[PDB]
Design an enzyme around this catalytic site. Structure first.
Site, PDB file in Angstrom:
ATOM      1  CG  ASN D  76       4.337  16.118 -25.702  1.00  0.00           C
ATOM      2  OD1 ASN D  76       3.490  17.006 -25.609  1.00  0.00           O
ATOM      3  ND2 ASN D  76       5.525  16.197 -25.116  1.00  0.00           N
ATOM      4  CB  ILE D  83       0.640   8.746 -27.527  1.00  0.00           C
ATOM      5  CG1 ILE D  83      -0.335   8.401 -28.656  1.00  0.00           C
ATOM      6  CG2 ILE D  83       0.193  10.006 -26.798  1.00  0.00           C
ATOM      7  CD1 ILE D  83      -0.432   9.457 -29.735  1.00  0.00           C
ATOM      8  CB  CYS D  84       5.626  10.941 -25.643  1.00  0.00           C
ATOM      9  SG  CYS D  84       7.042  10.009 -26.270  1.00  0.00           S
ATOM     10  CG  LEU D  85      -0.212  10.447 -21.320  1.00  0.00           C
ATOM     11  CD1 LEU D  85      -0.041  11.944 -21.108  1.00  0.00           C
ATOM     12  CD2 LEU D  85      -1.654  10.116 -21.670  1.00  0.00           C
ATOM     13  NE  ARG D  89       6.355   7.373 -23.918  1.00  0.00           N
ATOM     14  CZ  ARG D  89       5.915   6.784 -25.022  1.00  0.00           C
ATOM     15  NH1 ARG D  89       4.816   6.048 -25.023  1.00  0.00           N
ATOM     16  NH2 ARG D  89       6.595   6.940 -26.155  1.00  0.00           N
TER      17      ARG D  89
END
Lengths: 287, 73, 604, 146, 71, 76, 71
Positions: D76, D83-85, D89
């Site tokens: 991720n 960052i993909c959190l 988001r």
């Protein structure tokens, strides 16, 4: 603006193009250089003086759109720090004060735009000192007082807008002008150290603010908000001035008629708690 | 007596203190009213900072006197 | 520029080209061009200087330059006359305004020509000292006197006329030109015109400097030769720029000093370092056992406490001037401690650093110290500050009458820590009796001994310590008042401390009249507050400790306000002998403010 | 937002989590630099990772922009630091705190989200071979995080 | 004055320092209390690594400050 | 008996001393009032410096005598 | 006036100096008389080392003052 041979539409379009170019900081220096904004006798200040002259001598030659666009362009140029210093050194504030200090001028739009530009320009201690040394506080007090008194004393001139829900009876030209004046007052209160704000607030201005509060239905929630903001800011800065506002009958009026002043305006409602805290700053206010 | 503290990043607050009160007591009250830990607090009066070991009477702080609060890292 | 630099290098050190008068005039004509910007002008100056190194080029350059200057001044005279006439009659006509505002105006070209000749006769750094004569001869050959007179008339008209606002700056280049023709002459002909012109137009000169302080770096620097014209703001800005001109990075020099013994701890830590080290070092102070203080903040507290401790009379270094407890003068008896000379030198260096650090000190020195540090001789005028009433008696002896009332001799009796001693002003001074036939020399000897001889060694050490950080020539541009303002700054009278440490009679802290008075005082400028404080106590300096240290003739006496039942029109009155202020109960705040302003202003 | 960032920093200072630390950069309270130590029993254990946090002018009503300055291996996390959190988001709320964000990031370090990854290659190698993913993560941490 | 030093990979300790002390002195004290030489010690505070050439005053480290050790 | 100690321009203080006591006792008694340690106080009388070893009797000190106090300028 | 400089084992030398003379000038005179470069000379008076950048009056050095030279 001096030459009448150039068409008005072409002049306005050129000014608008200059503003659009000046939106980018890179070319602001070039615009200042071309306009001579770094020298007290450049084209910029010549245009300022001509605007003042035409305002003083009422005539069809006045172009309100041109004046507002020119003030916007000057603000855009002053958005740059070195250009701001150059404009300040060249003597922008004295000329703007000359424009603003005109009395009984019916062209409230140009005066409001000039006052907004002056408020935006005044940023630091040196600019505030320059504004004060040029008799800024006295002219500001006189403008506010005479404007409010004339507005309250001449119901016939009132012509509020149609086709909208408004909470004021004035023509919205006086409204905008007074709003700009109160914005300038707030800016002066902010930037000033605190010693000199007494020369401004401790003056007949308090009577005008009390009149604004007493005449909500005439002046509008916006002006009520700005008056309450001025009161809250002056109490927060130099809280020892609190008794003065009590002598003027301003804080007692706010306390007694607090429910009356509240109205459907986002800024006013958001401000309310700050006003309450400022009032509570004094033990008698808290009680 | 009552003194005022101006937060350069906010509003003004009032403190009920005495001349004999040390600067540590003032810092604790400022934390109570604001929540800033005392060690993070820097107090300024008449252009000079204040030492926690000294008292208000030492710095000549009187009734209605307004201090300034700044934070330094 | 590159080609001519190479050519000059080759010539001074195959076939070489030879230039002719026509070519020299052609290259000079570059200056006259309206496109000659700053970069173009600088490159042209470099080219001309490189060409001048070839034989015969300098004479042609000078001849062409003088011809061009004469031609341009021919038009400049008429242009200035017309401009002055228009200013007197008066918006100014755009046609004649463009003759000056435009970059191609004749004034700019004249300034360029004068700068070019000055560069030619000044880049010869080893010959300027002897070429100044011929440079002045060339300048006089340009018969610029009429142009200078016309410029003076135009500036006078600008001063008299307000319809032109601050448009006098249109003549800014021309004024610069004048400086160019005077920066090399001796100012300690055109020389006779420089001083009167600057004296007459100091107003415009100071206005121009304030608007554009950078001008000081240019020809306007010459104004230092006449310090009277420069205002204190411009003077201090220029002094700060020059003192900071050595912009080398300042190494940090952390120290640690006990608060109680801050003076001695600082003396040990700093007095045993290098002079240039302290000059170029940024001082980070750290009070022993302190807390919650950053590096920058401690410096101000350190300076304040160190200044307070240095002038403590218990150290026998400085004594407070009578009636002026705030200000001190060096102590004669400092010889009791063998190290007093070193401590005086340390005081000098710390004062110099404070001036460099721009940290104001509440301490003050008698007029004698300021005059001596500025190099001015000390006379009875300085004695006035130290002993006002006694100076009055001295001057009364000298002039107001024929004295012959006291049997005083040419000697001074003193009590040094219980030891009675007599010091002879002149040889055999003890026996010679003071009379009208020898009073003129008697007073002079008395003042000289009091101010200079009694403090000779101590003040010399103080001066050498001070000059270690600030050049003597760099500091003599001020005067007594300006120098005092530089160290202590404009007095700042507190309002809260003044209010708390006050007393009332027939009034109360909550009284309406007292509230009005304190509201008015809190609404006063710093200068206004100092003026009121002087009107009340007689001096504009708050006591060292604060307003609780207020002292009068009889000793400690706090500020007191007393009700007055006289006619409300009566102006408020004061008695400085006890810090007493008799105030009428003014009904309105505005009336009270006006009356107090009138009183304090009429006091001066 | 200043009144909120002040109390956030005060909360971190009073009882900082031993797993991570953060503070202002150049006294710009809207710019923060944070440090994370690899979670125990994880391929990144024992490492040190630097992050840059930018607080929007309408904080806390909008999520802060957190970017991994240090190179790291994760399904991720992209090499550029993005960052993909979820909390950053869609699941952002004003009630959340920077300390909670740091704790969530530390948990995610040892608990990836392959089903919704940012860089497909890392997620694919993770799904196909857990041991290879652990090996490559360990090597990357040793190369950069250590 | 007293300072707080938590070892992320070990236990926590307290030390005594002065504002002028360099980070190298702090690492030397950490070695004395524990044994690991400064070169291997990693010091963290406020999310930034501490450099040996710097000092507490430069880092504005105050009393009771809590620093992190990685070893 | 009693003696007086005065500074250059400050207040005056009174000590209860006797001829036999050394100047150390006088310095200590000064310390209790002002707090200056004896090593820093310099005591003078009739324009002549005093010494710790000697006493009031050595300096022919008597009743209602005034001494002068100064603060030490340590050289280094 | 004149001052005297004495070494641990050597004889005593006389130097004619003035209060304005800096300790650097004293070391230069010592070098001229004996040849020892200033960098190799350490001057002590009253148990306190003498710095080059200061003068004689700074340390309360007077006529016939005795200084100790250590190399």
């Amino acid at each position: 603006l001096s030459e009448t041979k150039i068409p008005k539409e072409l002049r306005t379009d050129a000014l608008f193009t200059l503003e659009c170019i000046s939106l980018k900081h890179v070319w602001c220096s070039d615009i200042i250089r071309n306009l001579g904004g770094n020298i007290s006798h450049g084209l910029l200040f010549q245009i300022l003086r001509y605007i003042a002259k035409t305002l003083r001598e009422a005539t069809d030659e006045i172009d309100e759109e041109y004046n507002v666009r020119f003030f916007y362009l000057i603000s855009n140029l002053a958005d740059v720090k070195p250009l701001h210093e150059s404009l300040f050194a060249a003597g922008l504030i004295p000329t703007l004060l000359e424009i603003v200090s005109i009395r009984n001028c019916p062209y409230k739009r140009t005066l409001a735009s000039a006052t907004h530009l002056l408020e935006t320009f005044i940023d630091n201690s040196e600019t505030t000192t320059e504004f004060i040394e040029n008799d800024g506080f006295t002219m500001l007090i006189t403008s506010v007082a005479n404007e409010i008194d004339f507005t309250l004393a001449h119901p016939e001139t009132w012509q509020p807008p149609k086709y909208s829900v408004v909470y004021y009876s004035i023509s919205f030209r006086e409204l905008a002008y007074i709003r700009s004046l109160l914005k300038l007052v707030l800016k002066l209160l902010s930037t000033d150290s605190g010693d000199r704000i007494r020369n401004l607030i401790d003056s007949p201005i308090l009577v005008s603010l009390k009149k604004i509060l007493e005449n909500k239905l005439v002046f509008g929630l916006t002006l009520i908000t700005y008056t309450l903001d001025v009161v809250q800011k002056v109490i927060n800065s130099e809280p020892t001035i609190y008794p003065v506002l009590v002598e003027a009958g301003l804080i007692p009026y706010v306390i007694d008629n607090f429910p009356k002043l509240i109205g459907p305006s986002a800024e006013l409602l958001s401000l309310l708690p700050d006003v309450v805290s400022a009032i509570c700053l004094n033990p008698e206010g808290l009680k | 007596m009552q003194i005022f503290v101006k937060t350069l990043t906010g509003k003004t607050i009032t403190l009920e203190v005495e001349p004999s009160d040390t600067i540590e007591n003032v810092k604790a009250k400022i934390q109570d009213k604001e929540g800033i830990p005392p060690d993070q607090q820097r107090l300024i009066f008449a252009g000079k900072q204040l030492e926690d070991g000294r008292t208000l009477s030492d710095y000549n702080i009187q009734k209605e006197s307004t201090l300034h609060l700044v934070l330094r890292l | 520029q590159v080609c001519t630099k190479t050519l000059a290098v080759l010539s001074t050190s195959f076939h070489l080209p030879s230039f002719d008068e026509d070519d020299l005039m052609k290259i000079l004509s570059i200056i006259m061009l309206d496109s000659c910007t700053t970069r173009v002008f600088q490159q042209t100056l470099n080219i001309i200087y490189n060409l001048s190194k070839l034989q015969g080029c300098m004479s042609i350059f000078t001849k062409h330059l003088v011809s061009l200057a004469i031609s341009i001044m021919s038009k400049l005279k008429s242009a200035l006359d017309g401009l002055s006439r228009e200013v007197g009659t008066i918006e100014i006509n755009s046609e004649l305004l463009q003759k000056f505002t435009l970059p191609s105006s004749d004034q700019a070209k004249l300034l360029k020509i004068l700068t070019t000749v000055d560069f030619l006769y000044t880049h010869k750094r080893k010959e300027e000292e002897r070429n100044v004569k011929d440079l002045q001869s060339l300048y006089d050959k340009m018969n610029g006197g009429p142009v200078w007179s016309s410029l003076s008339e135009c500036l006078s008209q600008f001063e008299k006329s307000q319809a032109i606002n601050t448009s006098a700056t249109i003549l800014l280049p021309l004024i610069e030109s004048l400086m160019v023709v005077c920066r090399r002459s001796d100012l300690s002909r055109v020389e006779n015109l420089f001083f009167p012109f600057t004296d007459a137009h100091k107003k415009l000169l100071n206005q121009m400097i304030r608007s554009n302080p950078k001008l000081m770096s240019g020809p306007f620097a010459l104004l230092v030769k006449n310090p009277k014209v420069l205002d204190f703001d411009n003077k201090r800005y220029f002094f700060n720029a020059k003192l900071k001109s050595d912009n080398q990075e300042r190494p940090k020099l952390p120290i640690t000093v006990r608060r109680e013994q801050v003076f001695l701890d600082s003396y040990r830590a700093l007095f045993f370092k290098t002079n240039d080290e302290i000059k170029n070092s940024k001082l980070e102070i750290t009070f022993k056992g302190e807390s919650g203080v950053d590096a920058g903040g401690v410096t101000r507290e350190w300076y304040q406490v160190l200044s307070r401790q240095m002038f403590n009379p218990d150290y026998a270094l400085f004594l407070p001037v009578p009636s002026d407890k705030t200000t001190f003068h060096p102590n004669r008896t400092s010889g009791i401690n063998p190290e007093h000379l070193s401590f005086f030198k340390f005081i000098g260096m710390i004062i110099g650093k404070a001036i460099r650090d721009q940290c104001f000190l509440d301490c003050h020195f008698s007029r004698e110290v300021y005059k001596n540090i500025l190099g001015r001789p000390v006379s009875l005028k300085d004695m006035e500050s130290l002993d006002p009433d006694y100076y009055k008696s001295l001057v009364w002896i000298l002039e107001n009458d024929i004295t012959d009332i006291i049997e005083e001799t040419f000697s001074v009796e003193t009590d040094d820590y219980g030891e009675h001693k007599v010091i002879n002003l002149i040889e055999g001074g003890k026996d010679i009796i003071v009379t009208e036939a020898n009073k003129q020399d008697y007073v002079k000897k008395v003042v000289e001994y009091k101010l200079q001889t009694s403090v000779k060694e101590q003040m010399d050490n103080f001066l050498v310590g001070f000059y270690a950080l600030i050049s003597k020539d760099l500091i003599t541009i001020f005067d007594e008042q300006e120098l005092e303002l530089l160290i202590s700054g404009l007095p700042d009278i507190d309002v809260d401390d003044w209010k708390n440490n006050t007393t009332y009679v027939n009034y109360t802290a909550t009284c309406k009249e007292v509230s009005y008075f304190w509201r008015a005082v809190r609404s006063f400028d710093a200068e206004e507050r100092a003026k009121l404080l002087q009107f009340v106590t007689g001096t504009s300096k708050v006591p060292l400790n604060g307003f609780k240290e207020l002292s009068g003739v009889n000793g400690v006496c706090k500020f007191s306000i007393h009700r007055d039942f006289g006619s409300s029109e009566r102006l408020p009155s004061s008695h400085t002998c006890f810090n007493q202020l008799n105030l009428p109960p003014y009904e309105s705040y505005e009336t009270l403010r006006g009356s107090l302003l009138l009183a304090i202003n009429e006091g001066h | 937002a200043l009144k909120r960032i002040h109390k956030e920093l005060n909360d971190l200072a009073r009882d900082p989590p031993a797993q991570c630390s953060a503070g202002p950069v150049g006294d710009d309270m809207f710019h923060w630099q944070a440090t994370i130590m690899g979670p125990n029993d994880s391929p990144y254990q024992g490492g040190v990772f630097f992050l840059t946090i930018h607080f929007p002018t309408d904080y806390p009503f909008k999520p802060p922009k957190v970017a991994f300055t240090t190179r790291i291996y994760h399904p991720n996390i992209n090499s550029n630091g993005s960052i993909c959190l979820d909390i950053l988001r869609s699941q952002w709320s004003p009630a959340l705190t920077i300390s909670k964000v740091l704790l969530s990031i530390c948990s995610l370090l040892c608990d990836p989200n392959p089903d919704d990854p940012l860089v497909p290659e890392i997620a694919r190698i993770y799904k196909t071979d857990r041991e290879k993913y652990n090996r490559i993560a360990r090597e990357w941490t040793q190369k950069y995080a250590m």
